[PDB]
Amino acid sequence: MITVNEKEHILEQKYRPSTIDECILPAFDKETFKSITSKGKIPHIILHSPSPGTGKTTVAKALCHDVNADMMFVNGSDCKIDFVRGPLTNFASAASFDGRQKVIVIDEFDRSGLAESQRHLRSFMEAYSSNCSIIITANNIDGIIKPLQSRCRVITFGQPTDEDKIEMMKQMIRRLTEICKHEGIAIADMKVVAALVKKNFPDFRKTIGELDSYSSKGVLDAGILSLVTNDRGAIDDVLESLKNKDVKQLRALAPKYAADYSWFVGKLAEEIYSRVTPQSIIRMYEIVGENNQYHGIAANTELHLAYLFIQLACEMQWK
Amino acid sequence: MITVNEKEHILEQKYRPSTIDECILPAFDKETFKSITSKGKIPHIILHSPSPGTGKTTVAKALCHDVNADMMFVNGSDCKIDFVRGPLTNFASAASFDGRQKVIVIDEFDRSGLAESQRHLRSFMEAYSSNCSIIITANNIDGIIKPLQSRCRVITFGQPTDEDKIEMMKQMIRRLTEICKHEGIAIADMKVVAALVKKNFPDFRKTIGELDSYSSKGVLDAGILSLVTNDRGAIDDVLESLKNKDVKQLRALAPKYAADYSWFVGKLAEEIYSRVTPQSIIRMYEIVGENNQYHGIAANTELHLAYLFIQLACEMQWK
Amino acid sequence: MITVNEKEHILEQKYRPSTIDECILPAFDKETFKSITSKGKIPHIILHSPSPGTGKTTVAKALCHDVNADMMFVNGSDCKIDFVRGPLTNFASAASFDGRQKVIVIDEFDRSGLAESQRHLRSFMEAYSSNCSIIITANNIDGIIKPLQSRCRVITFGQPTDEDKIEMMKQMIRRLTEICKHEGIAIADMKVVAALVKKNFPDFRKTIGELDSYSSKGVLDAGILSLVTNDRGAIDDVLESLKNKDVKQLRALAPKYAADYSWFVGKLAEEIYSRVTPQSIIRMYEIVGENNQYHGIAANTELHLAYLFIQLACEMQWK
Amino acid sequence: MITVNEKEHILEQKYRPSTIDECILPAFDKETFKSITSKGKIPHIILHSPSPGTGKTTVAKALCHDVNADMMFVNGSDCKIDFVRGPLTNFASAASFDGRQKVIVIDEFDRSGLAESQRHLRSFMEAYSSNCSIIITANNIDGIIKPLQSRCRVITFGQPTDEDKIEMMKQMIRRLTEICKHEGIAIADMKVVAALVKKNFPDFRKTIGELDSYSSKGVLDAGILSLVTNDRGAIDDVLESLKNKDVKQLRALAPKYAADYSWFVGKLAEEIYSRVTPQSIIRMYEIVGENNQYHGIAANTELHLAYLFIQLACEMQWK
Amino acid sequence: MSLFKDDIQLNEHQVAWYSKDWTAVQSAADSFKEKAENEFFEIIGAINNKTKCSIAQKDYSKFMVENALSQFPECMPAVYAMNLIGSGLSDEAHFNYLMAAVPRGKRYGKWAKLVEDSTEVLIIKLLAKRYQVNTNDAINYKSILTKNGKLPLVLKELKGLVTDDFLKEVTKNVKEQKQLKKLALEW
Amino acid sequence: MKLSKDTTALLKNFATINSGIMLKSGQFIMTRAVNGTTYAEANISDVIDFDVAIYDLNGFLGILSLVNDDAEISQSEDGNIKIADARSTIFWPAADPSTVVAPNKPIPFPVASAVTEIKAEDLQQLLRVSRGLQIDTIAITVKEGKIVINGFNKVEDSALTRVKYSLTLGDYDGENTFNFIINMANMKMQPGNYKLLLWAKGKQGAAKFEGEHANYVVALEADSTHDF
Amino acid sequence: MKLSKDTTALLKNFATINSGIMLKSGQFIMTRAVNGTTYAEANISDVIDFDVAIYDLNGFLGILSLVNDDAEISQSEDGNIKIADARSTIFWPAADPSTVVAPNKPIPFPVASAVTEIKAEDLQQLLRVSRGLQIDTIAITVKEGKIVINGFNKVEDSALTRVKYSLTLGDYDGENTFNFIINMANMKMQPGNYKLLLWAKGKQGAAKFEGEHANYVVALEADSTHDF
DNA sequence: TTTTTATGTACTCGTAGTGTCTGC
DNA sequence: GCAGACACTACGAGTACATA
Ligand SMILES: Nc1ncnc2c1ncn2[C@@H]1O[C@H](COP(=O)(O)OP(=O)(O)O)[C@@H](O)[C@H]1O
Ligand SMILES: [Mg+2]
Ligand SMILES: [Mg+2]
Ligand SMILES: [Mg+2]
Ligand SMILES: [Mg+2]
């Protein structure tokens, strides 16, 4: 069942699912993607998934594959307005040779400073809507301007239920077993992979990345003793920096997580709550909420986040 | 008596109105457009509305069609100054052998980087105004410089009167019924159609897009009505959690009620007003209202509502 | 008596004044323009005004008509330095066949990108100053480099003294009556014309444009008067409720003014100012301004208005 | 003893000094220019002043007239690299049989785009310093490359000492009296000329231009004095309202600056910055910035500006 | 050389111009350039020392000034104050507020961020370009590949993406001439 | 309506005066510079049978050069200009008549104040000398009883006193003295023999070059002097 | 390999279509645009003896230009490539085949729905006319029994109603009426005689220009109507 | 002492590349 | 005649500006 590119050297790029069925998705989400892939043509879609690694890019490419569409994958940061006027317009305005609908998958179109490309896309997506649809994948949909949201059918990856969580769990077990069989890795104990994929759920990209990082030894023994910040989904590095009261490291680190402020601030609040005394919890709520109030008027997000880091370092009693 | 473009498969693009009569506009707006088409000469117009889907591009194309104008539809973001000196000047300086007026529809001409191009137009529209009008559709009027707003009849979409909002909703319901009859969508009950029309109003396009999305098989089922209506229900659990002063329950209940803050805060104010001491009520309006007045600039609405819950637990007394 | 341009259908382009006497100019400006036409030689002039429609282009062309100048009307944004080195210099160096004075009307010459042509002009206006003068129309005088403002008579349009603003309004009302009579537009009430002049002043172009807009059927009546000046409601119930500090009544009345928030809040501040001690007037000025500042941000306006009402009642004093 | 160009008709060009003795230079500058003329040879000079109309071009032409130099006048913006390689080298290499010193006056040579063209000129002087001398008149000295300033004698205009300011104001009043008696203009009040000189100092060209502008009827009476000394467009009314906490005056004036918000705010901040305590400086800049950031969000811009006035008048402590 | 043993000893510029050797004239005129004057660091330092200054004739950039001052927490409450509300203020007023507000201090140093590399930024950019992932995911991929041990194979695969104009994207300084050989043969 | 080689060369020359030409029916084409510094007419052989205004004359002539000389030019049913070839048809757009700055009527030149004649060889060598000695100004004046064109370089000699070229045109029998200055950038004449008429009255002045087919009126410079 | 003048010019033309190209073993080379709107192939006389992928065909041809034509191109011991010609031996990197975008399969053009021919002079005239008239789309259609290329300016004519150029290609002698709209940016062919084969079926279709050297398959625009 | 954002747009200048006309 | 000279065009460097 599994799909392997046999060329890529990264497991999370080599074992990327090629079909909506192969994707590990909630039952409702998989059903609403099948209702689109079974309808023939694809309209404009915006795949929104606040939690990283749920698979918006994989789902978009699978949607293009199921319909048998002439996909043109474009990263959001590589979709500058001069690219939209050039190769993208040339692509959309022309019909494919073998009658396949053209779809442009703009990946992470929200995480970018280029909101001036979305303004062009506003009417680009109406000029060539009979020939080329657009699938825009976004982390937080506040980044996608309102007119594009009106143009595009917005599909938000819902939170899985309990039954869906268990089904995802078992599907993840089977998929990792097949990946390890195909990659020449022997599994020591199945509980190891079960604990791994429970720890990194629903961030399957993080799980595959951890497995691929471990794959040097060819055997899975520890699994849970993970390092190197465990992908960008984890935020433990910020907590370690704040514990040390290292203001310079916080200043140098703020630009890393300023690209997605909306998710980072919530994850930061959730993680700090469990690690601090209640009084400093109530203090951090006021501080973080005050910084969150003024994000919209903040000219630079990096300086805003750096100030939030400074306030947290200088006004919290750790536990 | 409907307009169908068989080339397109997007439902909001296939059924785009082609005449001002077929458009769904407020009484005064439609009267203005009918007057303009009856005079036989379109002036400079700026159709602007912050909320997309209100019918600006439709009205511009319909004004060009009704007047039988020589229409040049240009993406606004492509209408740079070298475009105004080139294709626009070549178009505006072409002979009108058959008496057709020339109308240059500059769609979505609110991009900031085009200010300079707009500053070139403010004299263009005075030298070629004998036979070449300009219709500028924009989302935010602040992106169109003041000298252009002076030269053009500025018409604001998406702001109808109370007695006209209901009429436009009724017209939308009739048009959606006709669309469903044409597309082969068999509506179970028109109540779901009315829910779709009310939910996405004044965005008439997001309405047709949702009509297509909630019609996967070929029928609008009753469960669609419960899906679109949403609004959840009574928030008594949140009020009890605030009284119990349990932070974790507050943040567990925050995300579900964060989707619709613009009602959740109204419900909270209407309900918990009697559930706390009158003296502290001002504090609530010193808190809750202030918390609301920052909603549009708050990055993480989940964290904003958790912050609201935090202050409500901290600074309120229970009778 | 009026100047009517047959080739133009736009009302504000059709009735463009051709002589200085026909222009609606301040008392001092019209004398300094009739003096220029009396001497027979136009000096370098810069007609500038932040508000469009004040009459800068009209006066610039009417001066060259009054002295019978050899006007070369040039779009400012098309007056790049290669144009100044070429056609403009050929124009200024040469002497006209008929002996008329040469004038270059560089209309709308305030673009920042042309600052490298203005820098070329500051010697052009000295080598060919005995032959060809320059009339620069601008919207912001800060776009005209200081050496260029030194070489020209800088005349600011649209800032008349109080005793002169009323004469402008009387002249514009008379001219609007003449335009209506020429256009076959029946006026039933002159108060609507007076209010139409008042609203758009000093933007006379927008005054004529709104005269056209509010005359779809060619009749100005009481309904048009109510439309131009709004005045949808009156403020007595809100004031009386604030006298009684009726929280429930204020909450109920908040959604009423959710439509015309700006007009309601302005009228409310105006009514409140006349009935409060000076000590508190400052306080509720701050309150009302703070509430109005975030209106475009707050999701629930009803809640915003309730917040404003309770703030007013808490910081309240009837004098 | 005045110099009249009967060919010219602009007043500020008709009376242009033809010699150094006729200028209104400071004591030191006039002495050094007289020494240069007496020596007989002009060195490389750079006459620069940010304030236009100080006398740079006049002094350059007057030097080349006093020493009977073979002046070649160049528009500085035309002194591109081909001009340096072409006409300039032809001029410097040609033989001066009359013994007249070759002087190249490169007027207004402060353009940045001519950076490369200046390097060649700096090389040019190293090869043709004996043949020809170079006078560069400029406004922005930073536009002339540093090596040119190193090679040339830089002379800064328009920064005279207090004694020099008094003496040159007296000289300019005398010269304006001569101009008026030469133009057939009767001077009724002698203080009007002093007011004209004081207001437009150190711009002498603007002084002559204002003299021509205000002498429309040929008489300079106390009305002209009121017009010259009383600057319409200033914020003196707003400033005195702010210092007095005049609620009524600020309320009345708020709609007067409604249209020109940004420029008025900038001017207001620039004016107040010098008249308040440092702590008041921080506070005022904070309020101005915060209000200006919400300019596009608040509904009532007039009430917005009234709020600005209230805050500024309240939180300010004049020195 | 110089068959004539008397001569007049013309300098470089006289020989270049009198011969009409416009290549030599261009070379001699290029000997001035002098790209210098470090306009920025005499504003920030001035702000750090409250010394009187004027920028009316100068060029002021709010982003660079704020980022430079943000390195020092003592001045950052002012910076944040201009980070929210200074967007509408003029450059002159922005500088004036930063002058009046930022407290004086003997603060100097290097900007806090990743300290270049030109051996790691190129790898990140190349991985991001090849795999069509963002910079953060490119760092993740490189960190995985270094630990896994497959990085040299990947570099051998995508060393072709390195080209003449690609290196200019990595950095602006004149060091990319070495970079062409750095991945000349990864093998 | 075919355009011969001579008519096409004439219209190409006219395109250097005004970017576009409003050419009306008949055998007569006239153009005026946008700034009105140089007017020109010509009585041409190829009869024009339809009024049309061309906003871009150089482009139109280039398109004509793309097809053969046998191309038949007509007015398309649309309204544009249809150039028909053996196998290709080109529809050059017709401009709005008000966007092309053209004379309303052929300006009637007054009775000439001074009449002389400049031959084709003399005009050609004057233009070549202008390219060589870099003179951008000429002055038609009287010297020792003969009309001479003095070529000055205005860039280095602002006062027009260092004569760089001097071409003797013919004898002058009148009793008036004049110095009619003409910018050489305004001499857009095609090579040929031109009868040079010069008229001046106070601040008014012009110089007409009557050719065998085309006549070019040229505006004198502002610092011209005369006593007519 | 040896790359003659003709093959080098053909490769320079192919470099416009795609930045790079995988040269596979044999006498056949092919490439396609990155987005897939056009494809090109050729049967070159020169024989390629080893598979190699060039990420920068423009740079490779620039290197080959200054070196003599008879230069021998082979693969180096370390995986790169080397061009050796007497005094010169220049090394050029060979990128991974999966890095550069090539069709990976020669597209078999189906039997044409309509076959015509466009001459080299006719194609060149179409290209120069397209430059002069700012024509950006052409439409091959059936008009009065002939097959004609109508050139429209899509910018000023969104619906392609105002014809700006019309070139007759030859008699149709068929029974199906079509209108194949080709963007002029997709036409990357070099000058020459071309056999134009237009194929269509449902919503799929293409236009193949078969030349004496190379065959270019271009994609029709979105709104191309037909009845095949 | 004290490094240098990213994107989009507009203008100017200098030069190298290309195409066309041509004079002793 | 055709190498040489002139004119048009595209690109890079540099500057300036707005916005986030
Ligand atoms: N729902 C899913 N089902 C299967 N694999 C997934 C899923 N989500 C992520 N992955 C893994 O993540 C890799 C890429 O993740 P991606 O789709 O880019 O997630 P995101 O864009 O949210 O970070 C794929 O190789 C795939 O193996
Ligand atoms: Mg992804
Ligand atoms: Mg639209
Ligand atoms: Mg104007
Ligand atoms: Mg000067």
Side-chain angles (χ1 to χ4, degrees), chain A residues 290-315:
Chain A
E290 203 87 29
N291 191 251
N292 192 96
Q293 281 179 357
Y294 305 133
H295 178 238
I297 75 185
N300 190 7
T301 310
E302 269 145 280
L303 307 186
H304 206 65
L305 210 48
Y307 185 79
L308 171 77
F309 288 163
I310 280 180
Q311 296 293 109
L312 259 60
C314 80
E315 214 170 357

CSV table of all heavy atoms in Angstrom, one decimal, chain A residues 290-315:
chain,number,residue,atom,x,y,z
A,290,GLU,N,-1.2,40.7,27.0
A,290,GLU,CA,-0.9,42.1,26.7
A,290,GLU,C,-0.1,42.1,25.4
A,290,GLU,O,-0.3,43.0,24.5
A,290,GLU,CB,-0.2,42.8,27.8
A,290,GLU,CG,-0.3,44.3,27.8
A,290,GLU,CD,-1.6,44.8,28.5
A,290,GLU,OE1,-2.0,44.1,29.4
A,290,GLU,OE2,-2.1,45.9,28.1
A,291,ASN,N,0.9,41.3,25.3
A,291,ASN,CA,1.7,41.2,24.1
A,291,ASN,C,0.9,40.7,22.9
A,291,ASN,O,1.1,41.1,21.7
A,291,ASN,CB,3.0,40.4,24.2
A,291,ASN,CG,3.9,40.5,23.1
A,291,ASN,OD1,4.1,39.6,22.3
A,291,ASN,ND2,4.6,41.7,23.0
A,292,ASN,N,-0.1,39.8,23.1
A,292,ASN,CA,-0.9,39.3,22.1
A,292,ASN,C,-1.9,40.3,21.6
A,292,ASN,O,-2.4,40.3,20.4
A,292,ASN,CB,-1.6,38.0,22.5
A,292,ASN,CG,-2.3,37.3,21.4
A,292,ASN,OD1,-1.7,36.3,20.9
A,292,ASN,ND2,-3.5,37.7,21.1
A,293,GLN,N,-2.3,41.2,22.5
A,293,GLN,CA,-3.3,42.2,22.1
A,293,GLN,C,-2.8,43.2,21.0
A,293,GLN,O,-3.5,43.5,20.1
A,293,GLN,CB,-3.7,43.1,23.3
A,293,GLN,CG,-4.7,42.4,24.3
A,293,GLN,CD,-5.0,43.3,25.5
A,293,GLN,OE1,-4.4,44.4,25.6
A,293,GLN,NE2,-5.9,42.9,26.3
A,294,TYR,N,-1.5,43.5,21.1
A,294,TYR,CA,-0.9,44.5,20.2
A,294,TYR,C,-0.1,43.9,19.1
A,294,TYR,O,0.7,44.6,18.4
A,294,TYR,CB,0.0,45.4,21.0
A,294,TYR,CG,-0.6,46.1,22.2
A,294,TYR,CD1,0.0,46.1,23.4
A,294,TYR,CD2,-1.8,46.7,22.1
A,294,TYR,CE1,-0.6,46.7,24.5
A,294,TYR,CE2,-2.4,47.3,23.1
A,294,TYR,CZ,-1.8,47.3,24.4
A,294,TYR,OH,-2.4,47.9,25.4
A,295,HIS,N,-0.4,42.6,18.8
A,295,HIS,CA,0.3,42.0,17.6
A,295,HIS,C,-0.1,42.7,16.3
A,295,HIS,O,0.7,42.9,15.4
A,295,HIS,CB,0.1,40.5,17.5
A,295,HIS,CG,0.7,39.9,16.3
A,295,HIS,ND1,0.0,39.2,15.4
A,295,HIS,CD2,2.0,39.9,15.9
A,295,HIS,CE1,0.8,38.7,14.5
A,295,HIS,NE2,2.0,39.1,14.7
A,296,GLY,N,-1.4,42.9,16.2
A,296,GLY,CA,-2.0,43.5,14.9
A,296,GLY,C,-1.4,44.8,14.6
A,296,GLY,O,-1.2,45.1,13.4
A,297,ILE,N,-1.1,45.6,15.6
A,297,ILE,CA,-0.6,47.0,15.4
A,297,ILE,C,1.0,46.9,15.4
A,297,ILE,O,1.6,48.0,15.2
A,297,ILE,CB,-1.1,48.0,16.4
A,297,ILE,CG1,-0.4,47.7,17.8
A,297,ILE,CG2,-2.6,47.9,16.6
A,297,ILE,CD1,-1.0,48.6,18.9
A,298,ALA,N,1.6,45.8,15.7
A,298,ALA,CA,3.0,45.7,15.7
A,298,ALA,C,3.6,45.8,14.3
A,298,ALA,O,3.3,44.9,13.5
A,298,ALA,CB,3.4,44.4,16.4
A,299,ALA,N,4.5,46.8,14.1
A,299,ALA,CA,5.1,46.9,12.8
A,299,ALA,C,6.0,45.7,12.5
A,299,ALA,O,6.0,45.2,11.4
A,299,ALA,CB,5.9,48.2,12.7
A,300,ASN,N,6.8,45.3,13.5
A,300,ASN,CA,7.8,44.2,13.4
A,300,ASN,C,7.4,43.1,14.4
A,300,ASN,O,7.4,43.4,15.6
A,300,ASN,CB,9.2,44.6,13.5
A,300,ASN,CG,10.2,43.6,13.1
A,300,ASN,OD1,9.8,42.5,12.6
A,300,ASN,ND2,11.5,43.8,13.4
A,301,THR,N,7.2,41.9,13.9
A,301,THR,CA,6.9,40.8,14.8
A,301,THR,C,8.1,40.3,15.6
A,301,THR,O,7.9,39.9,16.8
A,301,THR,CB,6.2,39.7,14.0
A,301,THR,OG1,5.2,40.1,13.2
A,301,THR,CG2,5.7,38.6,15.0
A,302,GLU,N,9.3,40.5,15.0
A,302,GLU,CA,10.5,40.0,15.7
A,302,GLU,C,10.7,40.8,17.0
A,302,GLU,O,11.0,40.2,18.1
A,302,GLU,CB,11.7,40.1,14.8
A,302,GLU,CG,11.9,38.9,14.0
A,302,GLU,CD,12.5,39.1,12.6
A,302,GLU,OE1,11.6,39.5,11.7
A,302,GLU,OE2,13.7,39.0,12.4
A,303,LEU,N,10.6,42.1,16.9
A,303,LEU,CA,10.8,43.0,18.1
A,303,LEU,C,9.7,42.7,19.1
A,303,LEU,O,9.9,42.8,20.3
A,303,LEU,CB,10.8,44.4,17.7
A,303,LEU,CG,11.8,44.8,16.6
A,303,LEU,CD1,11.9,46.3,16.4
A,303,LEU,CD2,13.2,44.3,17.0
A,304,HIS,N,8.4,42.5,18.6
A,304,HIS,CA,7.4,42.2,19.5
A,304,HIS,C,7.6,41.0,20.3
A,304,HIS,O,7.5,40.9,21.6
A,304,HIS,CB,6.1,42.1,18.8
A,304,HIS,CG,4.8,42.4,19.6
A,304,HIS,ND1,4.6,43.6,20.1
A,304,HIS,CD2,3.8,41.6,19.9
A,304,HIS,CE1,3.4,43.6,20.7
A,304,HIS,NE2,2.9,42.3,20.7
A,305,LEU,N,8.1,39.9,19.7
A,305,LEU,CA,8.4,38.6,20.3
A,305,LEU,C,9.6,38.8,21.3
A,305,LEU,O,9.6,38.2,22.3
A,305,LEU,CB,8.6,37.5,19.3
A,305,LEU,CG,8.2,36.1,19.8
A,305,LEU,CD1,6.8,36.2,20.5
A,305,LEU,CD2,8.2,35.2,18.7
A,306,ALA,N,10.6,39.6,20.8
A,306,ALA,CA,11.7,39.8,21.7
A,306,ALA,C,11.3,40.5,23.0
A,306,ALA,O,11.9,40.2,24.0
A,306,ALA,CB,12.8,40.6,20.9
A,307,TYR,N,10.4,41.5,22.9
A,307,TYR,CA,10.0,42.2,24.1
A,307,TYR,C,9.2,41.2,25.0
A,307,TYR,O,9.3,41.3,26.2
A,307,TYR,CB,9.1,43.4,23.7
A,307,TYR,CG,8.7,44.2,24.9
A,307,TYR,CD1,9.6,45.1,25.4
A,307,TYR,CD2,7.4,44.1,25.4
A,307,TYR,CE1,9.2,45.9,26.5
A,307,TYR,CE2,7.1,44.9,26.5
A,307,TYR,CZ,8.0,45.8,27.0
A,307,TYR,OH,7.6,46.5,28.1
A,308,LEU,N,8.4,40.4,24.4
A,308,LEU,CA,7.7,39.4,25.2
A,308,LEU,C,8.6,38.5,25.9
A,308,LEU,O,8.4,38.2,27.1
A,308,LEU,CB,6.7,38.6,24.3
A,308,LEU,CG,6.0,37.4,25.0
A,308,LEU,CD1,4.9,37.8,25.9
A,308,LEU,CD2,5.5,36.4,24.0
A,309,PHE,N,9.7,38.0,25.2
A,309,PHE,CA,10.7,37.2,25.8
A,309,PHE,C,11.4,37.9,27.0
A,309,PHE,O,11.6,37.4,28.0
A,309,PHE,CB,11.7,36.8,24.8
A,309,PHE,CG,11.3,35.8,23.8
A,309,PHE,CD1,11.9,35.5,22.7
A,309,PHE,CD2,10.1,35.0,24.1
A,309,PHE,CE1,11.5,34.6,21.8
A,309,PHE,CE2,9.7,34.1,23.2
A,309,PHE,CZ,10.4,33.9,22.0
A,310,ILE,N,11.7,39.2,26.8
A,310,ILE,CA,12.4,40.0,27.8
A,310,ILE,C,11.5,40.1,29.0
A,310,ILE,O,11.9,39.9,30.2
A,310,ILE,CB,12.8,41.4,27.3
A,310,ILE,CG1,14.1,41.2,26.5
A,310,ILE,CG2,12.9,42.4,28.4
A,310,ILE,CD1,14.5,42.5,25.9
A,311,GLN,N,10.2,40.4,28.8
A,311,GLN,CA,9.3,40.6,29.9
A,311,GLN,C,9.1,39.3,30.7
A,311,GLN,O,9.1,39.2,31.9
A,311,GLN,CB,7.9,41.0,29.4
A,311,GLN,CG,7.9,42.4,28.8
A,311,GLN,CD,8.2,43.5,29.8
A,311,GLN,OE1,9.2,44.1,29.8
A,311,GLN,NE2,7.2,43.8,30.7
A,312,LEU,N,9.0,38.1,30.0
A,312,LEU,CA,8.9,36.8,30.6
A,312,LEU,C,10.2,36.5,31.4
A,312,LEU,O,10.1,36.0,32.5
A,312,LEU,CB,8.6,35.8,29.6
A,312,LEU,CG,7.1,35.3,29.5
A,312,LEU,CD1,6.3,36.5,29.2
A,312,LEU,CD2,7.0,34.2,28.5
A,313,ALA,N,11.3,36.8,30.9
A,313,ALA,CA,12.6,36.5,31.6
A,313,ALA,C,12.7,37.4,32.8
A,313,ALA,O,13.1,36.8,33.9
A,313,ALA,CB,13.8,36.8,30.7
A,314,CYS,N,12.3,38.6,32.8
A,314,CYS,CA,12.5,39.5,33.9
A,314,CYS,C,11.3,39.6,34.8
A,314,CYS,O,11.3,40.4,35.8
A,314,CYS,CB,12.8,40.9,33.3
A,314,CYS,SG,11.4,41.9,32.8
A,315,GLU,N,10.2,38.8,34.6
A,315,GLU,CA,9.1,38.9,35.5
A,315,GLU,C,8.5,37.6,35.9
A,315,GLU,O,7.3,37.5,36.1
A,315,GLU,CB,8.0,39.9,35.0
A,315,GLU,CG,7.3,40.7,36.0
A,315,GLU,CD,6.4,41.8,35.4
A,315,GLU,OE1,6.4,41.9,34.2
A,315,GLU,OE2,5.7,42.4,36.2
